[PDB]
Each structure stands twice: as structure tokens, then as C-alpha cells.
Amino acid sequence: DPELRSWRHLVCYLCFYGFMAQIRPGESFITPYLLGPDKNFTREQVTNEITPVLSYSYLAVLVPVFLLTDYLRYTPVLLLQGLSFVSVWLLLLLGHSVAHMQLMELFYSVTMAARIAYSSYIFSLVRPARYQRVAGYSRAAVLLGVFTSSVLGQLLVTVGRVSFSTLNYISLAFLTFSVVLALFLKRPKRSLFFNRDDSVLARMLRELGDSLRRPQLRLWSLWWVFNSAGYYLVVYYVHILWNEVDPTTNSARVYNGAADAASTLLGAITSFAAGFVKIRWARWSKLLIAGVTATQAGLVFLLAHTRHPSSIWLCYAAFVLFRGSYQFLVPIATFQIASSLSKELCALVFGVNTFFATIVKTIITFIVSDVRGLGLPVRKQFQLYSVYFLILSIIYFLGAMLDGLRH
Ligand SMILES: CN1c2c(O)nc(N)nc2NC[C@@H]1CNc1ccc(C(=O)N[C@@H](CCC(=O)O)C(=O)O)cc1
Known part of the structure; x- marks a missing residue:
């Protein structure tokens, strides 16, 4: 030591x-x-x-x-x-x-x-x-x-x-x-899983199927798998779309950094405003997901359909609001998943949800975006991402009614 x-x-x-x-x-x-x-x-x-x-x-x-x-x-x-x-x-x-x-x-x-x-x-x-x-x-x-x-x-x-x-x-x-x-x-001298002086795994699995049948972990993991796979497929490709809307020769008129500093400033405001919402809005949870995902369905559609270079600031505003919509639901998802979980369990579930969201992100980007699949341009593949959020927000709105009229 x-x-x-x-x-x-x-x-x-x-x-x-x-x-x-x-x-x-x-x-x-x-x-x-x-x-x-x-x-x-x-x-x-x-x-x-x-x-x-x-x-x-x-x-x-x-x-x-x-x-x-x-x-x-x-x-x-x-x-x-x-x-x-x-x-x-x-x-x-x-x-x-x-x-x-x-x-x-x-x-x-x-x-x-x-x-x-x-x-x-x-x-x-x-x-x-x-x-x-x-x-x-x-x-x-x-x-x-x-x-x-x-x-x-x-x-x-x-x-x-x-x-x-x-x-x-x-x-x-x-x-x-x-x-x-x-x-x-x-x-550090000891870690959470491997370096611990001590089983950890046995305890985890035994204390998982009790927590896997929770209607808030199982709801927000399905948000983390699918509605976050479509989030990062917009963030990877929105700079390719902004280079198509306003293809300026002067580097000083690009403003990619002002649209990613404002999405961080709005992403920190909505993540702060979510902390007073994590518990009191946890009952109306599928309606909160379906309200934000349908808002993200319109913002990605607004990105895919603005073609004039004068409306590049509308594409900047439809991505600051898009990152602000997603970073609003991240402290709600982090709380509602890791509420009754251990620290070794919450590190596992957030790693499994990020892994399963990467499988969905790989499956879509091989079919929709890759040249070995469809090879779509960034406008025609943002229209497919727009109907991806629209399919997801309809599924969560049906879940907010077909499990919302049973009372
Ligand atoms: C660097 N940038 C980029 C780019 O602009 N263009 C190409 N072709 N390739 C790349 N490679 C990666 C990156 C675009 N892809 C990403 C990948 C990941 C993130 C990301 O981690 N965003 C975090 C916030 C962290 C941050 O602000 O950077 C989030 O939760 O939204 C943000 C953008």
C-alpha cells in the first residue's frame, strides 16, 4: 500500500x-x-x-x-x-x-x-x-x-x-x-467485479430474476435498447446532413460547435429538470416515453426535409432539441432501472442495455446505412430514422393505453 x-x-x-x-x-x-x-x-x-x-x-x-x-x-x-x-x-x-x-x-x-x-x-x-x-x-x-x-x-x-x-x-x-x-x-487497489477481495456472480444472477420482473426496469430497458439505438444513429450522421444543407466553403460559417455546445447546455438543463420528475412522473411513464419519442420523430423528420441552406439554423435547433429530448429521459431511465439494483447489478444492466442497444444500432446501420446493405444517403436514411421513432412512439402509446385502460 x-x-x-x-x-x-x-x-x-x-x-x-x-x-x-x-x-x-x-x-x-x-x-x-x-x-x-x-x-x-x-x-x-x-x-x-x-x-x-x-x-x-x-x-x-x-x-x-x-x-x-x-x-x-x-x-x-x-x-x-x-x-x-x-x-x-x-x-x-x-x-x-x-x-x-x-x-x-x-x-x-x-x-x-x-x-x-x-x-x-x-x-x-x-x-x-x-x-x-x-x-x-x-x-x-x-x-x-x-x-x-x-x-x-x-x-x-x-x-x-x-x-x-x-x-x-x-x-x-x-x-x-x-x-x-x-x-x-x-x-484503485480493488475493483467492483474482478479485483474485489471477496460469490459476486452467484449473488448477481440470484438477485436478477427478482428484479427482472419489475414493470419499471423492464419498461426503461426496452427504451434504452431501442430508443437509444435510434438516438445515436442520428448523432453519428447529423453532421453529414448539416454539410449537405449548408455546404459552405468558408470554415468560419460551419457552426457545428455552437450546435453541439447548445445541445450540451440544453442537455444539462433537461437532465437537471428530470431530477425533480424521476419519481413523481414515474406512474405516467409510457406516456412520457411516447411523448418524447414522437417529439424526436418530428425533429428527425424536420432534419430530413429541410433542404434550403438558409434553414440550417432550423437543423441546428432540431438537434439541440433532439439531444435535449433524449437527455431528459436519461436520468429518468437511470433512476427507474437502477432503483432496486445493487451496484454490481446496475453496472451489469446498464452494460447489457448498452450492449443490446449496440446490437440494434449495428443491425440498422448495416441494413440502412452501410454500402453492403442499402447504401442510403443521409437524407433518405434520416427519413427511415424518423419512421423508426414514429414506430417506437406508437408502440409506447399503445402500451400507454392497452395498459392504461385496464384500471
Ligand atoms: C467525431 N464524431 C464523428 C463525426 O463527426 N463524423 C464522422 N464521420 N465520424 C465521427 N466519429 C464519432 C463522432 C460522431 N459520433 C458520436 C458518437 C458518440 C457521441 C456521444 O457519446 N454523445 C454523448 C454526449 C458526449 C458528447 O457530447 O460528446 C451522448 O450521450 O449523446 C457523439 C457523437
Whole structure:
């Protein structure tokens, strides 16, 4: 056992690493960079040969990372997420082939699988009497870092007048700094599943079928599997659609970072406003899902049918409201699933729901989006995503009536 770190030097460093690990100013401007005059990629190569590999590689690495997150005690995977972000921005700046960007999506899928490597790091690092204050400060440092990277990426592009290549070298400097900050993180001695000194598995399975027959876990897991698979299929491809609506030559008029900083600012407001709604609106739960999914059905339809370049701000508003609609139902889903679950059980169910949502996301993106399937453009596949939410909101509205008139 090593020497214990100072407490104020620990929380001010977890909230500084969790702030600096989100600083990727050129993250919202990857698609205007790939579809720009610096990359030599067709519009049909980005939406049908590169971006479906993001959902393929996410399915392949979600279970290896989630096991390696708990086996390696959450410090090498926070380093793997930092080194895969450098490998994304090294393949952005030095990659020219389509296979160089399919590899880039492979490295970005490692970082998306390691998004829980920081939320579960401070869970095992901090004692439970001190955890909810540190998890409040950390989460408010993550969503401040996600906000201020899109603001810094927008101010460098619009006000600063830098190119997308220069912005990705600025983003590469903020990402090598996040690798150095991940080296000085205190590794925990025991983990939640594998490193525990002790069975854990036996207990889990035995305490699962009791919790599997809960009408709120079984309802919101089906939301997490299907209504979140269609969510991320919009977020992957909305930057390809914004490059089609307003195909500007000047990089300073792109405003992808202002539309992803506002969706983070609205995503933090609706997630805060959901915390006073998790319990008192849990009875009218299928009607809340069917009301938001039908709202997401109209916003994705509004994205797919705005064709004039002057209505690019309507496409920016129909995605800030789309991310605000989804991030409203995430604290309600996180509460109603993990209410009567253990911490080992809630880590399993949220990992299984994210895995099953990645199977649905892979099945749709192979049929609808991939060139080996249909090979649809981003407008004709956003019309299929619009009727995907409309099919889902009708199923939840029938469930809010065929289980709502039985009283
Ligand atoms: C970088 N960006 C991108 C892009 O713009 N264009 C292509 N072709 N490929 C890619 N690769 C990945 C990424 C677009 N795909 C994603 C994938 C995942 C997220 C994501 O984790 N969103 C989180 C919020 C975290 C955040 O704000 O980044 C959410 O819960 O909605 C957001 C966008």
C-alpha cells in the first residue's frame, strides 16, 4: 500500500482530468473536415463506408473494454481512452484513404466504450460517504468540459479564423495533455467485479430474476435498447446532413460547435429538470416515453426535409432539441432501472442495455446505412430514422393505453 494522496488535491485533480479529457475542439468539425477540401472523400464514402464502422467497432469493443475497465482497475482504460483519442486525431491529420478513416472510427469506438471508465473510476476511488459530492463535482466538470471544447472549437473557427487542419493540431495538443494527466491518476487497489477481495456472480444472477420482473426496469430497458439505438444513429450522421444543407466553403460559417455546445447546455438543463420528475412522473411513464419519442420523430423528420441552406439554423435547433429530448429521459431511465439494483447489478444492466442497444444500432446501420446493405444517403436514411421513432412512439402509446385502460 502506497501513501494516501491529499483529499483536496485529489478532487481538484479528478475534476481537472475530467475537465481536460473532454477538450477536443475539432470534435464537432470532423465531418466538415472529412467532407472538406482537405481529405478527398466522397459524400457517399463518409456516410456509407466510414461512419457505419463506428457502430461496428463499438459492438466489437464494448464488452472487451467493460471487462478491461474493471479488471485493470480503471486507470489503464482512462489511458487507453486518451491514447485512442490521439490515434483518432493522428488518423485525421495523416490519414488519406478510406481504410485510414475506418481505422479512425475503430479508435473512436474504444473511447465511446471507455466513457464509463471515468464514472466508475471515481466510484471505486472515493469512499461511499464521500462519493456523491465528488461525483457531483466530477460530472459538473465533464459537462463543463464537453461544453467548453465545443465553445473553444467554435471560437477558434469563427472568431479565431483557424482552419480545420489547424484546429485538429490544437485538438491534438489538448489530447496529448490528457494522456499526461491520465498517467498521474491514482489507481484503485480493488475493483467492483474482478479485483474485489471477496460469490459476486452467484449473488448477481440470484438477485436478477427478482428484479427482472419489475414493470419499471423492464419498461426503461426496452427504451434504452431501442430508443437509444435510434438516438445515436442520428448523432453519428447529423453532421453529414448539416454539410449537405449548408455546404459552405468558408470554415468560419460551419457552426457545428455552437450546435453541439447548445445541445450540451440544453442537455444539462433537461437532465437537471428530470431530477425533480424521476419519481413523481414515474406512474405516467409510457406516456412520457411516447411523448418524447414522437417529439424526436418530428425533429428527425424536420432534419430530413429541410433542404434550403438558409434553414440550417432550423437543423441546428432540431438537434439541440433532439439531444435535449433524449437527455431528459436519461436520468429518468437511470433512476427507474437502477432503483432496486445493487451496484454490481446496475453496472451489469446498464452494460447489457448498452450492449443490446449496440446490437440494434449495428443491425440498422448495416441494413440502412452501410454500402453492403442499402447504401442510403443521409437524407433518405434520416427519413427511415424518423419512421423508426414514429414506430417506437406508437408502440409506447399503445402500451400507454392497452395498459392504461385496464384500471
Ligand atoms: C467525431 N464524431 C464523428 C463525426 O463527426 N463524423 C464522422 N464521420 N465520424 C465521427 N466519429 C464519432 C463522432 C460522431 N459520433 C458520436 C458518437 C458518440 C457521441 C456521444 O457519446 N454523445 C454523448 C454526449 C458526449 C458528447 O457530447 O460528446 C451522448 O450521450 O449523446 C457523439 C457523437
